[PDB]
Amino acid sequence: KKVNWYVSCSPRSPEKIQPELKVLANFEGSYWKGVKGYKAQEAFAKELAALPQFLSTRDRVAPMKTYGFVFVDEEGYLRITEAGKMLANNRRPKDVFLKQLVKWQYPSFQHKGKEYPEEEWSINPLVFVLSLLKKVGGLSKLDIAMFCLTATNNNQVDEIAEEIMQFRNEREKIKGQNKKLEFTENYFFKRFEKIYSHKSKIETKMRNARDVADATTRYFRYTGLFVARGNQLVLNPEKSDLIDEIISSSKVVKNYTRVEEFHEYYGNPSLPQFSFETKEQLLDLAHRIRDENTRLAEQLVEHFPNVKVEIQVLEDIYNSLNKKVDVETLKDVIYHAKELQLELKKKKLQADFNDPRQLEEVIDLLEVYHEKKNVIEEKIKARFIANKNTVFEWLTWNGFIILGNALEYKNNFVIDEELQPVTHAAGNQPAMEIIYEDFIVLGEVTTSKGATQFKMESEPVTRHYLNKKKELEKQGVEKELYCLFIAPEINKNTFEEFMKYNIVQNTRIIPLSLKQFNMLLMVQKKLIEKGRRLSSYDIKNLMVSLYRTTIECERKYTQIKAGLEETLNNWVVDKEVRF
Amino acid sequence: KKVNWYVSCSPRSPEKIQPELKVLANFEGSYWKGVKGYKAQEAFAKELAALPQFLGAFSTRDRVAPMKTYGFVFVDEEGYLRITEAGKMLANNRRPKDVFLKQLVKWQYPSFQHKGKEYPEEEWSINPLVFVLSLLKKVGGLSKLDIAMFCLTATNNNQVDEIAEEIMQFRNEREKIKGQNKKLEFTENYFFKRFEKIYSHKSKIETKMRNARDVADATTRYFRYTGLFVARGNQLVLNPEKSDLIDEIISSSKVVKNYTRVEEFHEYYGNPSLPQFSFETKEQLLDLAHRIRDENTRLAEQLVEHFPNVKVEIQVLEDIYNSLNKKVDVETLKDVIYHAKELQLELKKKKLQADFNDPRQLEEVIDLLEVYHEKKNVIEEKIKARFIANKNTVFEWLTWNGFIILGNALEYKNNFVIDEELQPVTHAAGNQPAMEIIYEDFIVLGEVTTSKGATQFKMESEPVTRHYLNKKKELEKQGVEKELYCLFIAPEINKNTFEEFMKYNIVQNTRIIPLSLKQFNMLLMVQKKLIEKGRRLSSYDIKNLMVSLYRTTIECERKYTQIKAGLEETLNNWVVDKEVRF
């Protein structure tokens, strides 16, 4: 028997399921089971690796089964559930996840019989964590790896809440931040020992837990039910009504041993049906969010006219309802309108940033990346669920939000409903794309150094830029394209290589040290103190200048290097603030 | 400016330095530089050629250069030949692997031998052996090829992280490539291009790659000699019994700046006490001595019931440690520790007898021996994938495991070199049999070759008979009264080689017994089946085999095919006698 439930790491973040599932849907109706199925699994594996997204079958497909996107009918054919179809078509993907993860239970068709007896097992894991959080405050990745994976029954909420509360109480006693880690780590080894070389073996289970707890946080956050506060998973205050209804109507259905019958329920993305899902109530919910958005916008359009973008998009979303007023159209309007709200929140950060303490938090946090590896990991884990690399992307992006005037601040790393970081940008994408009135600036960041940096950033960066420019041409968008490449320490060979690309291949890649990126932030801080702020033109100008310097200066590493410092300081001084 | 360091292949194996150095030390205080130097260098070359090792002058500067490179010797400001303290130790044959360990650790570029324009401080600051220690801590093992590709062209101690990085990636690229032949292509291609960036063009980069390979070989031999590294398969790894020493070596190593002036530099480099290690006090040397004792006592105690031939080592340990009843000084302790490790190594040879109770381990030696019936290219390929050593050395090694498996010897004396985990390094010298197996009341020399036909006759007739007659005179001389046999093993025994030994047996009173590889394995097969049944060969059974085969060689009709069939029958008789299933 098993004693933990798990969220697979294939992939670690949910948004990567969609492209694989889209490819898998093409094998619907293929023989899939045993030896007669080899030809299809083989053809799939292969058409799958051909994605830009990837440049063993049973291991990738398993999560898709587990979340009831797909199954194998009794006579051996691959089937795609209604939920799978919707996700493959990219229809309201986070709602599809929310509803599947809410119905997720043990036992199930995947996890039944011998290894999963009903004496031990009866749990909806997502809804467990929702109930559990109603008691405890939030749960770090380690809480979850420690305590939650091992829970096998919805009944164990209180027992497990209590036991966590005590672990917090026995840890408050241990003085020394160093000594607290020992206590925690030893408690971890012991608790798992009760439950599962002796020494090296339990440690490997503890490793596995920490991995699976990361994935868990990422999947649960993608639902919009949970968010991050600091390094703690907690409930989303905007979803209280829903979470309630979810806890109330939850259940472990007993009919899980026959594949067709089980998936008729578990594959159904309309289930569970919630109380507000009527035409009447969906209209109210659609209107309600329009009001929230109109409001947010209206409080911001004086100081920050770049919100006219969102305003126009809302008009476009809602205009559907002049054509159709059915349940389905309403759900799409509501989904899109919440995405658009999330865009509005990115623009509201612009306003939050008129507060020097808020602006300074980003500066100060960015500063941390000057410190040594060990101090980096420490101040991060204490403040964020996502790892340091992903947080650097997050922070830089906030930097561009500080500087203002973009029509869109397009993070390519994943964030949650409270704009907190989750997952880094995919290999085929820059970390962010900042879209202005008449130019576009890509953000490429890294924390890697020396020979390693060249390895890792040279080709990706130039390729992203060249791919992006191709796409603008294709779409006939006629804005200049720059790329700011930001690192705490830029490696000489990396720098020279982008220089080569700028003059030879006509890229506009501008390397700025972290120190230099920060000066921009401080510059904007001081402007705001004096009731002024950077314009779209100021940023354009800075980008044009620094690029000009890259192609016009003598082809000597320290020549260009000081040339950038030169152009930079020109622009700095120009804003007529000293220090 | 040079881009690689190097271990000379003169000699390729480090144990051959000692006798040269001993001869060379006789020339201490001789003028050695330039034109007045000619007389001395020539007297030396001549004395050097007199050794058993150069029979079975030329450029000296090449014989002597490694002795300069490792700090055994130098030419002083006035141009006289001087032997450093390390050289003196090694000449006298005191703790020679320790001497080597210390000199190779201190060894650096740049140096007194390797300085100036060819070796600029901008590019060069490396201790080669300590670099490979560091590197291995990251990548686990390094094949010769690895060493050829990545290591010889490192010129700075700080390149470790970088080269580790680069290797892991190369291993990740290679691992994804499907198909053995295509893996080889990529490997050769990566190698080719890498060395192109560093140095008929194609054939010039390939000479460099070949050299790199050869130097990698000598490198692994010298490094293994130190005991710091052992072989696992065809990989050089760190010796896990040496974690602590390795870490201390890494921490305290350095490239000293005072290399330009000869006397000053050698006062450091020729000092066989440097570097001084933490445990090298009387107190901690005592603990180290006691700790090795306990290792030895333990392995001897888990053996002595079923393998009472470990009584030899038990007694020798006693003799070694009883020195400390008389003196406990740092020097006596270093000697005690040195010998007790040597003796530990003997205990491990006796432990193999126990490991071999496991039918799988036994069978591995049979199947490896079995590979030498294949074509030359199959042999090379199957041995390069499993050993650092060449297939000729590995054949001596397997034959010797063959004798361990048959059991009962007081001593299994490999004359070829093995490392601290008993893996093979270097074939036996031309003036020795490959092994000497010593029992209670008889001795068996083992001579083996992979050679065939006229080239086997040419190579073997005279050295085999000469080894036998040298050993026999030496026994008489020492009053050791045991009969002396030799088993001569080859995959295919040449008619003329055979008849030559038969001739020497009956005319010159040798006891040379040539067995085919096939017949050798048949013995091991027999002992295997005896073990399956709770039995095993005794010392008697072995003696009986040797005596009988010998008798057949001198008693049978003097026709080649008669004696050849006589051996088969005697062998089959002894096999039948053992009552096993063939």
Tab-separated table of C-alpha atoms in Angstrom, chain A residues 452 455, chain B residues 165 169:
chain	number	residue	atom	x	y	z
A	452	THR	CA	28.068	29.120	-17.582
A	455	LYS	CA	26.493	28.586	-22.414
B	165	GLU	CA	30.919	21.667	-16.186
B	169	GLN	CA	27.560	18.383	-20.569
